[PDB]
Design a protein around this ligand. Structure first.
Ligand SMILES: [Ca+2]
Lengths: 291, 8
């Protein structure tokens, strides 16, 4: 049932781990066995729950496992039986993007079933109003399909249907599963604080801001900023993979070095203004027009 | 070294 699902997903990540035996986060060779190990722990703890019904622990696992399988098939399809170094290598980018997604699915699973043991009914968000929004709208649930989440979020922060809502969905759905967990919502509301202007912060900082990069790794940021070494004060920003919920700002320093920093942890709008004023964050993605 | 000090 659930146990059969969990056995299948374990063996599937072991296959991928063996197919990856040919580093620096996010690393598939690290994430796959850690995710497998956590799933072994989930399997044993459920053979013993939180409140059942829609969006409880069982629902989360069903959705999570069906997504993990889809993503594992994508990875499997890029790997030979037992070139990454060509410029513009499609294989390198697809693997990098998939490693990002496994990094997020590993973090989400660890947040909600640490040691195998479900805590989605007790989970507390980092920002208080976001916490209160979730629990007053979704109760003890830990996950929602996008459409229901969109509808619920709209009681407070409505998003224009169509292109904008899909852009929002892409930003929030870190695991690319079509569902929003309490964890994902935690991550989003930390990144785009403060709460009273949530979606306007998002519009300004992500949709309309040339410095915003989605689904880039640390090494992809170092590589992109190569183009800007002669432009001190060029910068971009993206979600940290190792510190989920925090921004990683990549910038070109005074000496043409490419540095990356985590500004723990005020609204990004304030970090940006303060860098602008001081002369560190002047040219988003190397371009003239700082928003 | 990976992530460096916030240059504020
Ligand atoms: Ca998701």
């Amino acid at each position: 049932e659930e146990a059969r699902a969990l056995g299948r997903a374990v063996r599937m990540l072991q296959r991928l781990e063996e197919q990856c035996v040919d580093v620096s986060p996010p690393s598939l060779r690290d994430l796959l066995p850690r995710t497998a190990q956590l799933l072994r722990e989930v399997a044993h703890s459920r053979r013993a729950g939180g409140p059942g019904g829609p969006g409880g622990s069982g629902d989360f696992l069903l959705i999570y496992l069906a997504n993990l399988e889809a993503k594992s098939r994508q990875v499997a399809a890029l790997l030979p039986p037992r070139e990454l170094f060509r410029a513009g290598s499609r294989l390198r980018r697809q693997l990098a993007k998939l490693a990002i997604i496994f990094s997020h699915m590993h973090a989400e699973l660890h947040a909600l079933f640490p040691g195998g043991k479900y805590c989605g009914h007790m989970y507390q968000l980092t920002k208080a109003p976001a916490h209160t929004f979730w629990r007053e709208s979704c109760g003890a649930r830990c996950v929602l399909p996008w459409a229901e989440f969109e509808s619920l979020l709209g009681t407070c922060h409505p998003v224009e249907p169509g292109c904008t809502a899909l852009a929002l969905r892409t930003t929030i759905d870190l695991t690319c599963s079509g569902h929003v967990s309490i964890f994902e919502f935690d991550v989003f509301t930390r990144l785009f604080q403060p709460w009273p202007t949530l979606l306007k912060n998002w519009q300004l900082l992500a949709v309309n801001h040339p410095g915003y990069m989605a689904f880039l790794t640390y090494d992809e940021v170092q590589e992109r900023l190569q183009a800007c070494r002669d432009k001190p004060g060029s910068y971009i920003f993206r979600l940290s993979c190792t510190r989920l919920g925090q921004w990683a700002i990549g910038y070109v320093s005074s000496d043409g070095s490419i540095l990356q920093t985590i500004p723990a942890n005020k609204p990004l709008s304030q970090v940006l203004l303060e860098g602008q004023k001081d002369g560190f964050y002047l040219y988003p993605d190397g371009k003239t027009h700082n928003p | 070294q990976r992530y460096s000090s916030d240059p504020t």
